[PDB]
Every structure is written in C-alpha cells, then in structure tokens.
Write a protein that binds this DNA or RNA. Structure first.
Ligand SMILES: Cc1cn([C@H]2CC[C@@H](COP(=O)(O)OP(=O)(O)OP(=O)(O)O)O2)c(=O)[nH]c1=O
Ligand SMILES: [Mg+2]
Ligand SMILES: [Zn+2]
Length: 1025
DNA sequence: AGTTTTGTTTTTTTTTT
DNA sequence: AAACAAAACT
RNA sequence: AAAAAAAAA
DNA sequence: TTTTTTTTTTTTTTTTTTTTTATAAA
DNA sequence: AAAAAAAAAAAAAAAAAAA
DNA sequence: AAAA
C-alpha cells in the first residue's frame, strides 16, 4: 500500500509538475456527467499515479552516472577475459577509482547531513533529548494469543482469524427498540437550542473556514488508508481549496459522502499494565483520510460554540476553559464534610464506562440530537457520516478484510468526544432530576455528580436507598443507550456509625469498598483528608529520587541535565501543586532541591552558583527552575477566581462555613474584616489568603481600597444603600468605583453618567456622594495600578496565570549575586563599564544557535575551569605552579592567555586576522569575553571572528593540563567541523545568503594555507564553491 | 536616533480521558 | 523557548 | 500510533 | 470590646567551613 | 578560591489578659 | 549521539 513520502514534496521539479496536473485534471474533467463525490475520488487516484511516476524517474536519474560507469568498465573487462591488454587495464583502473570515489562521497554526505540535524537540537528540549531518557519504542507485533479454547496459540493464521472475529463481533449488534428510546427521552427534561443558535449550525461552509482548518492540522502524523498526508493539503491549499469548497457545498445539498470518507485503518495498541496475550486488552485506534477529518473538524468546531448551553458544569472533560483540578478540590471538600459530620451515613462512588466510545448506540445518539432541537443540514450530514462506516485491521503489517461499524463512534475522530458527552449528559440530567437519589448538602450547595469524560464520581446520602435507585436508573439507560459500567475499575468509600450497618450495606451492593484510598484523575483521594500529604507528596519525592538515580550516567552535560529536569520533572510537580494546594513543610523543598542539583552536577560540587543561574539575564539564558516560587504562584492563583465570582465555580463554594459563608466574594480589593475566626478548618482557601497578603505587604501595597474596588463591595454596603441602587449602577455604568468617578469627577465623567445621576433613590445618592468625595477615597482610588494588581483585576482568561505570577515573583524576590565578569576585570588591570558588562552578556546569548558552541563560551566567561592556584588552596599545598611546566604561577589568565605554550596558537589566530585584513588589538578580553574596544563596535566582521575564537577555546581546553603546545592543525580541524554543521543546516533553513557572507572570506584563507596532502588526509574541500 | 522591553506567534514536551 | 514587531525612554 | 481539552517552557 | 504584650515561626544576612584531582567527547 | 549551609536576629501575627 |  502506497504512502506519500514527505521528502518528495521538497523538490522544485516535483512540485512544478504536480501543480501542473492538479490544474489540468479539473479543467479537463469537470462536466455534467459526474457528481463531485465521484469526481473527487477519481482525482485522488490520478494524483497518486503521478507521484509514483515522478518518484521512479527521480530515483533512476540520480544513479545515471553509476549506470554509465558500471557498463563502460564492465565492457573493457569483458574484453579482458579473451585477451589481456595493458592500456585497457590502465583505463579500467582509472574508472574503477572514480566509482569508489562517488561511493564514498554519497556515504559521507549522508553522515554529515545527519550530524548537522543533531547539532542544532543537542541539549535542547526536543525529540533527541526526550528519546535519550525514554526506552526504545516497542513494536506492534502479535505473536501469541490466548485462544477461545483456553489454549495459547502462536500459529499466525489462527491469530489473524481470532482477532478479526472478535473485533467484527464487538461492532456488529445494533439495537432496534426505537419505541423505548422515545419513551426514555420523554421521561426527563432536556435543554434546547433556540432559533438563532440553530441557524448558526446550519449556515453554509465557506472558503475562509476551510483554509483556517488546513493551517492548524498537526504535522508529522500518519496518513489515512488513501496515503495522503496533512503536508500535501498545506502545500497545495491554493489550488485545492476552490475544489474542496465545491465538494462540501455538494455534500450539504445532497447529504451524500464519497466512498473513501467511510474508510479507516484500525491499529491495535496495548493498554498499559494489562496482559498483551489477552485480545481483550487492546485499544483500537482508527486512521482516517485527511479530507474526512477536515469535514469532521468543521462540524465539531460549530457544535463546540454552543456546548456550554448543552452541558452542565459538573462535566469538565473535553470542555474548553474548564480544569480537571475543579473536580479534585470539590471532591476533597465533600470528604472533609463527611469527616466532620456527627452522624455518618454517606457513600462516595467512582464509576467508569467499559469501552465507552465503542458501545454507543447510533440510533439513540441521532434521536438525542433531535431532542435537543438539532435538525436541518447539520443533522443531515451527521446522519450521513454514521450511515455506513467500515474498518480494515492492519495486523503484523498485513491488511485484513473489512467489516461494518454498526455501533460506536470512531476513537480517532475529532467529532467523537463531543457526541459522546452529549449522550452522557442525558444520564447526568436524569440523575440530578431524580430526588429519591439523595445528594449531600453543603450549606446551601447540593452536590450529586462530577464528570470527566466517561469518568464519573457520585456523592450520596442514605446509601441503602440512594444506591439501589441509582443502579435502577443506569439499568434503564443501558437498555436504550447501550452504556455499560465497568465492574473491575469501580470503587467506593462507605461511611456508617456501626459495623453491623456496614456489613448489611456491603451485602446489598456490587461495589468494592476501599479502606485507605482511591486513585482518581492522577491523584490519590484518601478516606480521611489528614492522610492527604502522606499519600500524594511523600510518594512523589521517592519517585523523583529513583528516577534521577537511574539517569545518573546519561551522556549529556549540565546544560542538558537542566533541560531534562524542566522537561520531565517540572510538569508532574506542577500538576500535584494545582490539584492539592495544601500547606507543605519546607523540608519538602529542601529534599527536592538537593536531589535535583545532585543530578545536574553529577554528584560533584557545583561549578557555577545556583544564585547566578536563577536569572535569565545571567549565564546566557540557561536558568535553573525555582520550585518554591512555582509553589507560591499556584497557591495565590486562586485569588483570580475569588475576584471573578463566577456562577460555574461551585468548587470554591463548598468549603466548611459556620462563619460568614460568602466571605471569599468580599476579600480581594475590598475592605478588611474584624472577625478573625473564619477559615478555621479551611484546607485550601485560608492558606491562599495568607500568601496573597504577605506578597502585597512585600510590595508595599495598600490592598484594601484600589482603582479596582467593585461597586458591589463591603465599602458601599456599609453605607446603607438599597440593592436597586447598587445594581442600577452595574447595569448602567460599569463594575468598579473608578467607573463611577471619585472626588471632582463623582458622576460627572460622562453625559450618560450625569443622565443617570438623577435616577437614584433620593437618600442613597447623598450617602454615596459623601463617600466618593472624601479625601482618603480620592487619593487611594486615583493611584496608578501596579503589574501585580493588573494580573488579578484585568484579565478575562485564566489561561497562563501560573506563568505570569511566577515571572512577577522572580522580580519581587530577586537576590544579589557575585559577578564573575568583575573578577576577570580584576585579573586584568582594567575597569569594565556597565556597557561592557552588557556586551559580555549579549555575546554569551548570541554567539551561536547551537547549545554546544554556546556552552563553551559560557564556561569561559563564568570561570568554570580548574586552575593550579585553586587546587593548591583546596589541597592545602604550596604547589601552585602551571601543570604544563613553564614554571610560572597557574592563574586562570595564565592558562588561557599567557602560558608560552599557548602563545604560539594565539599568534597564529592573529596572523589569520591580518590575512582577513582586519585589525584588532592583541587583548585577552576580545577572544575570551567578547568585549571589543569602542572603535570596533560598528564593524560587521564580528560573526566571523566569533567562529575563529571559539574554535581556539575548544583546542586549548581539550589539552588543558598536558605539557605540549596546542597546534594550528587541530584548530583548523575544529573550525572546519563547525563550518560543515552550519552549511547543511543553512541550506535546510535557506539561510544560505547569510552563511556565505560569514564563511566565504575565511574559507579561502584556510584552503590557501594547507597542502594537497593535508587536505586529502582531513577531507577539507569547499562546500560553497 | 538607538536600544530596550513587551506582546504575539511558532515550536517543543507533559497531564488527564 | 525564540524571534520579530511596536512603542516608549534614555 | 490516532483524537480532545489543559499546563509549562 | 479594644489595646497591649508575649511567644512562635519564617526569612534574610553574615560568617564559617569544605571542596577534588583536566578537559572535551560521548 | 568559591559555594553552601548554618546560625542568629528581627519582624509580624496570633492569642491571651487587663484596662 | 540522543529522529524520523
Ligand atoms: C486513554 C485514551 C482515551 N481516549 C478516549 C476514548 C475512550 C475514552 C475513555 O478512555 P478509557 O481509558 O476509559 O478507555 P475505554 O474505551 O473506556 O476502555 P475501558 O473499558 O474503560 O478500559 O477516552 C482516547 O481517545 N485515547 C486514549 O489514549
Ligand atoms: Mg472507560
Ligand atoms: Zn604555563
């Protein structure tokens, strides 16, 4: 089976001829005889023909030389068999040399192109470094199956039969009781779209909507069964989009898809931590054609706009703007309520659907869409999509015969997650409506359910009655929907007063009772909340320690090991903070910091101080992660939700509250409280407040009356004003006191405000007028807002809060550090200005794109390298003399610049600089630090000089303690290595116009100095010329 | 007039189902 | 995380 | 070896 | 009820003690 | 020579007792 | 060397 090779798209000739047939095919073909649905499948066949012909001609042509050499050489040696001749043997030798030459040239270029790609990515958070810590990807091979007879069988054809019969049977059985589906849908009250919303679904597709979806398709993904990739559609989007538009307009009119839209390839993926030999334990993922996914993406984007009308906020899975941590914190709050309660009669149940996407009955799903009011061209296209889908299974690389999909949604389709949620929402609305299943009461809140996709947790009171009635409702939903609950995964916590009562209830119900803990959404829920640190955070420390110990000998530098900690450790640490922001002992941070540094410095003491690595400005952009500041950023983030006061955020309302249950609405940018018994038992919210207040006083803010203080605040409510007045202002003028006006501007800011000024209850206005015109009010409200205050007040999205708060916290807590650049200035007798120190820092960032070259420069500036002076102090010895043996004191400036064994190399470099006809003083600050004297500031040759000097640093460092001169030829080899890596990458990026500027002059000089012998031994030849 | 800072856009990996 | 664009301040 | 949402660099 | 005083915890600053054996390439 | 850790002080908040 |  063909697949498009994406490298084939790169090529100028291939693009030109393919782009020519795309135009030619449609202008010839497009006539009344044939529909677009057929015409589109005919086009794809022709286009697949062309690519195979163009591949073959390309691949023949590139060996044409070797064809001619091999025939020509074989002809002369074919004569050599009959008679042996001298001059023929000479020509044979000549041509046979050239054949071996081109064999070598092809081999080297393959190696150098591979190396160049890796040279750009090294030590970067990228696929190579990700793969270094990963194991090998493990192949998709079924060689053993547990058999229907109970036997283990490895006969391949019996494997191919046993798998196919099982997957064919799973999808086969379509329910047929359509009368009962109506009766259940009538039983319960469901939402509906209005006429304006419905018109938004059914509107015509347009060219701008298509190109937007093409631009966003993921690159580097497997194609569908017809073999075309996302990169094809992105490349020819100009020619294709007119014809794609004609296709979708034809599908709207008729509700008929092309035949290829139904095709998909199933690949079987083993589920983690289950027997592979059981056929029961594989996940069938489906590969679909990219044109079919472009249509399905259109439909999913349209329904997603409305989805918050259809789906209650108990469901957070797949929904835009929701967070999984919402359900975690709500659940922990409920468990604490049960722990405190005097009379315990309560149960908490975790439920998962078995094969949730595969068991959805398609007739019930289409009835549900009609019951919500979805009809017209949108419903017509959805019905066409489920009309006859089929799958082929690809086992051991061999493509089996295809079966119909009579049930389920495809797992691998963009439209499947939302359709599943809309069907599950019918059951959720039924459970909430039914009052003989009793929720738990938390002050004024009732909590029955939390959902995350197919994952369900249920909170019940009086379980013997409530649990039986829940099961009966799910039985009835199963009969119509096909939904089924997964008996192996399902667990409960049961709370009762006496052992006898637990014994009886356990006998009734089908569920498995968890004594200590239930794993939930990535974390452990504990039966008592006091256990919460022990079960979640102490394991996480132990798991990070084991993980760094395994990696201890990986072959990367401290630069790469820092990036491993960011990529692998940091995401899981942030996830636990965000789910469970409880108050953590400082020993947690001490253990986490020691472990992480011990890994980065390879169990030897640090070469560069963690203080210096803290700031991006220092050490060339390399920066260490600060775990205490990420913790603080996560804890204070909650205050953004307190200010917003959203009706969806029921997770915030459910903390225990004897005193002042509304207080969190009042805390932020609002007036202080004199009662200080609130949040006495709070797990999360009280600790958030104490962190918020500490940061405000660090900044020297007054947090209590601000440019952002709301009209709906305690300030105005302590004035005794009627709610009709307060809400009138929010409806008419704005949210904040500043929107009203204060002092001189009290209402007079705008004509619409002065028009309002008469509209208020006569007594209220005089009360307001006194407060707004007071002297303290005028000063406090008129000040400029800081950046900290803008984070919590201004932004409408929660997106990216941790990232913003962390960047503020690093400026607020910024420390003093020693500067190595000042110590260099003391080793030389010179002063460096603030402008020089800035130049050294900019050079340390901009010397190269590769981390390999940048690391060398960073190590040199930051005084990384050991010296005899340092070692004499450490070893408590007088033997401070140069390891090379020139007899002088081994200072760092001796080692790099002044040792007579190093000096002949640096004079070589300056002799090249004179051949470039530059002029530069002979001054250690220029090559080592990158600090040039002012006259040279404006020169354009700095990029060339940077490659010359860093090559010299590599040469000296590779022989650091050895009693011999670094040589000019070793320098030339390094400089040529860098030239080769940059050349192939430059062509790949088409940066080649810049590349020729930098290297072209330098390359001519290097080649002039070598002999033909040296050039051959070291393979030094021009890649530009 | 030049340099520095802020914000958006393109590219990586990890978390859940 | 990088680079480019845009606006303000030295 | 595919999909959706979220997070960080 | 309000104000004052004492106790505990956390953060910042300064002093004192200890280190690794060469490096880049891999 | 340089980095890290420990030690000591200072500051604020919380709780109790008296004005 | 640490990708397709
Ligand atoms: C993890 C994962 C999940 N999905 C979707 C589609 C199904 C639902 C539920 O997944 P689940 O693990 O319950 O699997 P399920 O089918 O429910 O099988 P079980 O019977 O629950 O084991 O999420 C997916 O598309 N890709 C994935 O990699
Ligand atoms: Mg499931
Ligand atoms: Zn020396």
């Amino acid at each position: 089976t063909w697949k498009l090779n994406n490298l084939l798209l790169n090529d100028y000739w291939v693009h030109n001829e393919m782009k020519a047939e795309i135009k030619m095919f449609f202008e010839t073909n497009e006539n009344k005889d044939t529909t677009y649905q057929n015409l589109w499948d005919a086009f794809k066949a022709v286009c697949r023909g062309k690519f195979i012909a163009l591949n073959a001609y390309k691949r023949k042509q590139e060996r044409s030389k070797i064809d001619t050499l091999t025939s020509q050489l074989k002809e002369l040696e074919k004569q050599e068999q009959t008679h042996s001749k001298a001059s023929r043997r000479q020509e044979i030798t000549k041509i046979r040399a050239e054949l071996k030459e081109i064999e070598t040239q092809k081999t080297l270029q393959k190696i150098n192109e591979s190396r160049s790609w890796f040279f750009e990515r090294i030590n970067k958070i990228d696929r190579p470094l990700a793969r270094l810590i990963k194991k090998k990807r493990e192949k998709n091979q079924i060689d053993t199956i547990k058999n229907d007879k109970g036997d283990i069988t490895t006969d391949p054809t019996e494997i191919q039969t046993t798998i196919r019969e099982y997957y064919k049977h799973l999808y086969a059985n379509k329910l047929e009781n359509l009368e009962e589906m109506d009766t259940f849908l009538d039983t319960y009250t469901l939402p509906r779209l209005n006429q304006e919303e419905v018109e938004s679904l059914n509107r015509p597709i347009t060219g701008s909507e298509i190109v937007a979806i093409i631009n966003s398709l993921p690159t580097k993904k497997s194609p569908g069964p017809d073999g075309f990739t996302a990169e094809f559609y992105q490349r020819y989007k100009e020619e294709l989009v007119p014809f794609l538009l004609k296709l979708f307009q034809s599908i709207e009119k008729e509700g008929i898809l092309p035949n290829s839209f139904y095709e998909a390839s199933i690949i079987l993926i083993p589920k983690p931590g289950r027997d592979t030999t059981k056929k029961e334990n594989f996940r069938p993922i489906s590969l679909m054609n990219i044109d079919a996914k472009i249509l399905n993406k259109i439909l999913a984007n349209r329904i997603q706009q409305h989805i918050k009308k259809l789906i209650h906020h108990d469901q957070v899975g797949f929904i835009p703007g929701m967070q999984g941590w919402f359900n975690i914190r709500k659940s922990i709050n409920v468990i604490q309520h049960i722990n405190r309660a005097k009379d315990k009669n309560h149960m908490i149940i975790s439920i998962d659907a078995e094969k949730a996407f595969d068991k959805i009955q398609q007739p019930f799903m289409l009835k549900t869409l009609n019951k919500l009011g979805i009809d017209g061209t949108y419903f017509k296209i959805i019905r066409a999509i489920y009309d006859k889908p089929t799958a082929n299974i690809i086992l051991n690389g061999q493509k089996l015969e295809a079966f119909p999909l009579k049930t389920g949604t495809r797992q691998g389709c963009p439209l499947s997650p939302l359709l599943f949620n809309i069907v599950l929402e019918v059951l959720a609305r039924a459970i909430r409506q039914e009052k003989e299943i009793k929720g738990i009461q938390l002050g004024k809140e009732e909590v029955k359910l939390s959902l995350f996709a197919d994952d369900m947790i249920v909170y019940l009171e009086n379980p013997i009655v409530s649990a039986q009635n829940l099961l009966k409702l799910i039985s009835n939903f199963s009969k119509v929907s096909g939904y089924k609950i997964n008996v192996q995964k399902s667990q409960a916590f049961l709370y009762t007063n006496n052992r006898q009562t637990e014994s009886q209830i356990m006998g009734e119900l089908p569920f498995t009772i968890a004594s200590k803990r239930i794993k939930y959404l990535g974390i452990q829920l504990t039966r008592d909340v006091k256990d919460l640190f022990k079960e979640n955070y102490k394991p996480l420390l132990k798991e990070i320690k084991e993980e760094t110990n395994k990696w201890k000998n990986i072959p990367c530098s401290w630069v790469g090991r820092i990036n491993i900690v960011k990529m692998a450790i940091l995401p899981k640490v942030i996830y636990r903070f965000n789910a469970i922001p409880i108050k953590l002992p400082m020993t947690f941070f001490t253990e986490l910091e020691k472990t992480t540094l011990k890994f980065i410095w390879n169990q030897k003491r640090a070469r560069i101080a963690k203080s210096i690595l803290s700031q991006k400005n220092k050490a060339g952009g390399i920066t260490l992660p600060d775990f205490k500041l990420y913790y603080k950023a996560t804890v204070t983030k909650t205050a953004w939700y307190w200010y917003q006061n959203r009706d969806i955020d029921q997770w915030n309302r459910t903390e225990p509250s004897e005193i002042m249950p509304h207080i969190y609405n009042y805390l932020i940018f609002d007036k202080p409280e004199k009662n200080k018994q609130w949040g006495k038992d709070s797990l999360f919210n009280k600790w958030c407040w104490e962190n918020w207040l500490a940061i405000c006083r660090k900044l020297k803010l007054d947090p209590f009356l601000t440019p952002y203080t709301k009209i709906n605040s305690r300030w105005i409510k302590d004035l005794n004003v009627k709610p009709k007045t307060i809400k009138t202002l929010e409806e008419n003028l704005g949210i904040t006191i500043q929107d009203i006006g204060v002092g001189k501007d009290f209402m007079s800011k705008t004509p619409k405000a002065m028009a309002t000024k008469d509209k208020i209850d006569k007594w209220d206005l005089i009360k307001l007028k006194s407060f707004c015109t007071a002297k303290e009010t005028t000063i406090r409200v008129n000040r400029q807002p800081t950046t900290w205050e803008k984070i919590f007040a201004t932004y409408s999205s929660d997106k990216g809060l941790i990232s913003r708060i962390y960047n503020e916290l690093k400026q607020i807590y910024k420390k003093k550090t020693n500067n190595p650049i000042k110590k260099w200035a003391k080793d030389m007798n010179r002063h460096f200005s603030k402008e020089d120190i800035y130049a050294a820092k900019k050079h340390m960032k901009k010397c190269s794109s590769s981390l390999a070259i940048r690391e060398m420069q960073i190590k040199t500036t930051m005084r990384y390298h050991l010296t005899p002076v340092r070692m004499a102090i450490i070893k408590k010895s007088g033997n401070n003399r140069c390891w090379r043996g020139c007899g002088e004191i081994g200072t760092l400036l001796h080692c790099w610049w002044d040792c007579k064994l190093v000096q002949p190399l640096w004079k070589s470099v300056w002799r090249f600089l004179r051949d470039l006809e530059l002029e530069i003083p002979f001054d250690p600050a220029i090559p080592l630090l990158g600090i040039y004297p002012n006259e040279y500031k404006s020169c354009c040759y700095k990029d060339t000089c940077t490659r010359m000097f860093i090559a010299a640093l590599f040469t000296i460092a590779k022989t650091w303690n050895q009693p011999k001169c670094p040589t000019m030829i070793d320098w030339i080899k390094k400089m040529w290595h860098i030239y080769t890596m940059e050349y192939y990458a430059a062509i790949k990026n088409d940066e080649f116009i810049s590349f020729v500027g930098t290297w072209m002059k330098l390359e001519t000089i290097i080649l002039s100095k070598l002999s033909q012998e040296q050039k051959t031994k070291h393979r030094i030849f021009s890649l530009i010329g």
